[PDB]
Paper text:
The [name] tumor suppressor protein plays an important role in DNA repair by homologous recombination (HR)1,2 that takes place preferentially during S/G2 phases of the cell cycle. [name] is a master regulator of the cell cycle that is upregulated in mitosis. [name] is recruited to specific targets via its Polo-box domain ([name]). [name] interacts with phosphosites characterized by the consensus motif S-[pS/pT]-P/X23.
Here, we demonstrate that the two conserved residues S193 and T207 are phosphorylated by [name], and that phosphorylated [name]-T207 is a bona fide docking site for [name]. To demonstrate the recognition of pT207 by [name], we measured the affinity of recombinant PLK1PBD (the target recognition domain of [name]) for a synthetic 17 aa peptide comprising phosphorylated T207. Using isothermal titration calorimetry (ITC), we found that recombinant PLK1PBD bound to the pT207 peptide with an affinity of Kd = 0.09 ± 0.01 µM, similar to the optimal affinity reported for an interaction between PLK1PBD and its phosphorylated target. A peptide comprising pT207 and the mutation S206C could not bind to PLK1PBD, as predicted from the consensus sequence requirement for PLK1PBD interaction. Finally, we determined the crystal structure of PLK1PBD bound to the T207 phosphorylated peptide at 3.1 Å resolution. Analysis of this 3D structure showed that, as expected, the 17 aa [name] phosphopeptide binds in the cleft formed between the two Polo boxes. Twelve residues of the peptide (from A199 to I210) are well structured upon binding, burying about 694 Å2 in the interface with PLK1PBD. The interface between [name] and PLK1PBD is stabilized by 12 hydrogen bonds: the backbone of residues T200 to L209 as well as the side chain of S206 are bonded to residues from Polo Box 1, whereas the side chain of phosphorylated T207 is bonded to residues from Polo Box 2 (see the zoom view in Fig. 3l). The side chain of S206 participates in two hydrogen-bonding interactions with the backbone of W414, which explains the strict requirement for this amino acid at this position. Moreover, the phosphate group of pT207 participates in three hydrogen-bonding interactions with the side chains of residues H538, K540, and R557 in Polo Box 2 (see the zoom view in Fig. 3l).
Residue numbers in the entry:
A (entry chain A): 370 to 593
B (entry chain D): 199 to 210
């Protein structure tokens, strides 16, 4: 799931080079694929980077924190099972009930972040139903993230890249393994498209613009 | 309670 950014960059290059909003008749609806709907995405997030780090919630109700020291702590949706990731990327699986005294500080912080998100924030894509075996899938963690004047970029450990636009609340979820893109528009409508089909049928200026922006963002992730 | 730097969409 490492070399996935370069695949995503190639997929984006391909779609953007085809100038999808410049077709004779763009038939975006023909590029839709319900089978390509992602299993995981960031439904909530909090920036506390000045002192602690970034807290986030995934759509399965699991919470995670990417601390300033570049370590990660993830609490599974059961509210007891924990995953701790060191800077090197080494994973450790523990529980709140039987936790090392070494993680007491970081667990307390995660619980504050979890409680903040629950009390204050709206769940993105709350209406989406999970598939028959999705619950057994490996729970991803937040590898890296950054902010711009226009959006927040979230890079997950499973290779997926999420871009949340600030002004209009639109969101992109790029999955390189499925070569697909999920777009959540201003009306909160959730649509998943195959990138090879957007090349074939085209898309609206709105989505085409976000995809050009996404290419710039993926380039930044690769250069970092 | 100190408010965060930024956050996702707040509830209504």
């Amino acid at each position: 799931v490492d070399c996935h950014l370069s695949d995503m960059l190639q997929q984006l290059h391909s779609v953007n080079a085809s100038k999808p909003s410049e077709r004779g008749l763009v038939r975006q609806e023909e590029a839709e694929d319900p089978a390509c709907i992602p299993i995981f995405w960031v439904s909530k997030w909090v920036d506390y980077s000045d002192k602690y780090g970034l807290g986030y919630q995934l759509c399965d109700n699991s919470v995670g924190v990417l601390f300033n020291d570049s370590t990660r702590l993830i609490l599974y949706n059961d509210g007891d099972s924990l995953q701790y990731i060191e800077r090197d990327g080494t994973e450790s699986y523990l529980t709140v009930s039987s936790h090392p005294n070494s993680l007491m500080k970081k667990i307390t912080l995660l619980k504050y972040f979890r409680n903040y998100m629950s009390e204050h924030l709206l769940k993105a894509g709350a209406n989406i139903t999970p598939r028959e075996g999705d619950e057994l899938a490996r729970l991803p963690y937040l590898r890296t993230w950054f902010r711009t004047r226009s959006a927040i970029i979230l890079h997950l450990s499973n290779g997926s890249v999420q871009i949340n636009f600030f002004q209009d609340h639109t969101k992109l979820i790029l999955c390189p393994l499925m070569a697909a893109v999920t777009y959540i528009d201003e009306k909160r409508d959730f649509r998943t498209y195959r990138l090879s089909l957007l090349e074939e049928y085209g898309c609206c200026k709105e989505l085409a613009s976000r995809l050009r922006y996404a290419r710039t963002m993926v380039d930044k992730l690769l250069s970092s | 309670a100190t408010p965060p730097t930024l956050s996702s969409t707040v509830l209504i």
